[PDB]
């Protein structure tokens, strides 16, 4: 039945029905056991697509809102703001969903360095998504929770994973985006991203047959952001 759920998740992925993909992978996470690499990646993909669609919607709607604020479009702004607020409710629910699964199921059952760093990184990510649209105290709270999670993941990563590991590099990339976009700290963002990149360059012999393309891609993404920021 675990195998049955994974197969249902893959069918949903093929069909691009990511809502159903999430439902199937939530059930697997519900079993309170260590997920395989395949299962962690399917769970990550499912939520990344479900939340990604709403974050893209929110950025579009927000750009339209900024356009009308500049034009003085008061009547449209009433509709735009209500619309944005609806999408934020969806975002909050999606984040709370995965954050509850991480807290009750995935983190407690995690028993490898890789899976622990993966789930604390995910925990940092979904608090970061909360912080993207949050205002005032809610933003401070989501940023504090994201920071704590990224620190816990970074502690385990530095002790358990080589600097070339894609989960470690992805963690560095996301944490640097966190410093830049949430904490408003380009200095800290560039330092982390450059440090992670240089540490990988120094130990390229730790690259794995399983993931070297993923590491390469992430290293390129670190370099691209650094290009943007500097």
């Amino acid at each position: 039945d675990r195998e049955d759920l994974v197969y249902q998740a893959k069918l949903a992925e093929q069909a691009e029905r990511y809502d159903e993909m999430v439902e199937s992978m939530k059930k697997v996470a519900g079993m309170d056991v260590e997920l395989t690499v395949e299962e962690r990646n399917l769970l990550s993909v499912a939520y990344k697509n479900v939340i990604g669609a709403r974050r893209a919607s929110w950025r579009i709607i927000s750009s339209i809102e900024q356009k009308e604020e500049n034009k003085g479009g008061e009547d449209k702004l009433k509709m735009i703001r209500e619309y944005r607020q609806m999408v934020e409710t969806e975002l909050k629910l999606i984040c709370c969903d995965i954050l509850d699964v991480l807290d009750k199921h995935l983190i407690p059952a995690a028993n490898t360095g890789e899976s622990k760093v993966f789930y604390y990184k995910m925990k940092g990510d979904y608090h970061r998504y909360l912080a993207e649209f949050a205002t005032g105290n809610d933003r401070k709270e989501a940023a504090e929770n994201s920071l704590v999670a990224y620190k816990a993941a970074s502690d385990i990563a530095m002790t358990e994973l080589p600097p070339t590991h894609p989960i470690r590099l992805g963690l560095a990339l996301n944490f640097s985006v966190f410093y830049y976009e949430i904490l408003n700290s380009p200095d800290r963002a560039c330092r982390l991203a450059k440090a992670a990149f240089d540490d990988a360059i120094a130990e390229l012999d730790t690259l794995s047959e399983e993931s070297y393309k993923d590491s390469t891609l992430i290293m390129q993404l670190l370099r691209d952001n650094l290009t943007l920021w500097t």
């Binding site: 990339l173 996301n174 976009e181 992430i218 943007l228």
Partner: peptide, 6 residues
């Protein structure tokens, strides 16, 4: 536009 991890 920043990129984050896949």
């Amino acid at each position: 536009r920043q990129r984050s991890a896949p």
